[PDB]
Amino acid sequence: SSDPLVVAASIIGILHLILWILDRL
């Protein structure tokens, strides 16, 4: 388990990557 702040940041990071990929495709 992780700090809820870290879980939040990890999710935001992944969604950022996904949106970036979709933008370029």
Add this chain to the structure above:
Amino acid sequence: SSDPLVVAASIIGILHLILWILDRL
């Protein structure tokens, strides 16, 4: 809970994203 180093890095990462967004807006 997380290592204090990881908590620090997560906060820095989020603030980086926020500042980037504000810069572009």
Add this chain to the structure above:
Amino acid sequence: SSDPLVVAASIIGILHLILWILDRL
């Protein structure tokens, strides 16, 4: 130990960096 989601995000982040480096080299 960390949340499996955070472990996943950390791995993705590192592989992203590696691929970026290889792309530029």
Add this chain to the structure above:
Amino acid sequence: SSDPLVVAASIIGILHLILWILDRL
């Protein structure tokens, strides 16, 4: 505490930011 992999990724992430800043300055 965190998974050693996550600690490693957090350190790499921060050093990446620092080097980027120094490069631009």
